[PDB]
Structures are given as structure tokens and as C-alpha cells.
Amino acid sequence: ENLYFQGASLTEIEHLVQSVCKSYRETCQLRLEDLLRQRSNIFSREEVTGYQRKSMWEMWERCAHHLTEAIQYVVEFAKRLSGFMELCQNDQIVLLKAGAMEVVLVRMCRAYNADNRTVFFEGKYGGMELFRALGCSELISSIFDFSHSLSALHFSEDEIALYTALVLINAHRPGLQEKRKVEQLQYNLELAFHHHLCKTHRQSILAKLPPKGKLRSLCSQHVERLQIFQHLHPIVVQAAFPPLYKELFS
């Protein structure tokens, strides 16, 4: 059904590097150059206070819509990924439901500034205190710490491309019907990522990558915090939360 569902040659692995990097380039929601330029554009003490004074439900809704928009670009990235559209729909949905949020969490390090511990949010950079109204300080600080640790790796756009391809194509996701097909596609993407690192003398980052349990913890923490919020404001979830967000998380 696809060349990457079988053993690929070196030349075919080189093509895969280029294909993933291209799919990533085209599905970037935010340009790296725009993100770095915006670093000096920081929310004022008054803007911070204004976000903090927003009701818990209002803040949750704004964050849910922004997450949804990020997810939309990840679905497009998946569709453009070699072999993804050749998997069955059950498997595509299994991969996106378990991995979309994980991809968004990795992509986030680009919009995060390790210098002053700020993140790009609604046009400006702000510290974690910006999200205080959400009432999930442990999750937010765990998200800022993850972005901080990925920032210290100084990933290129091509490294993010390949590492995110691998975050999504995980043959271990519960519910995959064509597991062996996912295993071969995963093997080839692993080879494409490790090949690119070898060629660019960047293999030293492999031991530095976060353990898989780290992305899972962040994802389980998001699911848990959403359950607490849903109990408090069930009609907010039902009436004002985006349908794609709910399909993925509830």
C-alpha cells in the first residue's frame, strides 16, 4: 500500500527525510522567523492582570479554541506524512487521538522563550502567570518545564519535523488494527530521523530527548484537569468548547 510499509533502502530513507521535512514546513501554524521576531513583544503588567481577571470558564474556552486550531495543523501534517493516508481510518484516528496533543506539546517549544520563560499567546509573549485563571498551576508549570527542556536542545525545524513524525507514528498505541504496518512505517521514520542526525552530527541529542512517559503524563494531566473543569462548568463544555477538542479529550 506504501513503500514505507516494507524495508526501505538508504536512497528511500533520504527521500523520507525530505518528505517529512516538507510536510512539516507546509503545516506549520507559526513561522519560526515570526516567533523569534515577536520575542520583544511581551504582555504588560496590566495585560497580565487582565488575563488573570478573566473568569475560569472564559480562560478555559479561549485555551480550548487555541488548542483546537493547533490540532487542526497536526491533522494536516499527519495527512501529508508518507504512509499515513494508506493506513485504515480506525488506525489514523487511533494515531491522531493519542498523538495530536503530544505533537502540539512538542511544537510549543518553538513559541517558548527560555531566556525569560515566556510563551507566545494571543499575539504577545507572557509568563505562566498569564494562565492563573485556569486553576491548573501544576499542569501549566509542567508544560512550561517541558518546553524549557526541549528549548535547551536547540532543535532545528528539520529535527522537529522528524521527531514529531515519530511522536505520531507509534505502533504501540492501544487499538491499532494494522500494528505490523504501523511498526514498519515507524521503523522507517526512526531510520529517517537517526539518518538526518548522523549526517548533521546531531546524534548527541538522542540521549537528551524526553522519555515517552513524559508526554503521556502531560496528556493524562490535561485529560484529568478537563474532567475537573467539566464537573464545574458542564454547559460551558457542551455549548462553547470546540467539537474537535471534545472528540479528542472527552
Binding site: 481510518q89 489514523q92 491522531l96 474537535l244 472528540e247 479528542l248
Partner: peptide, 10 residues
């Protein structure tokens, strides 16, 4: 519903 729609829309 949405995920299905996004995957099928080319």
C-alpha cells in the same frame, strides 16, 4: 464526527 470529516476532505 470532525476527525472523520478532516481525514476524508481532499
Amino acid at each position: 464526527k470532525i476527525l472523520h470529516r478532516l481525514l476524508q476532505d481532499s
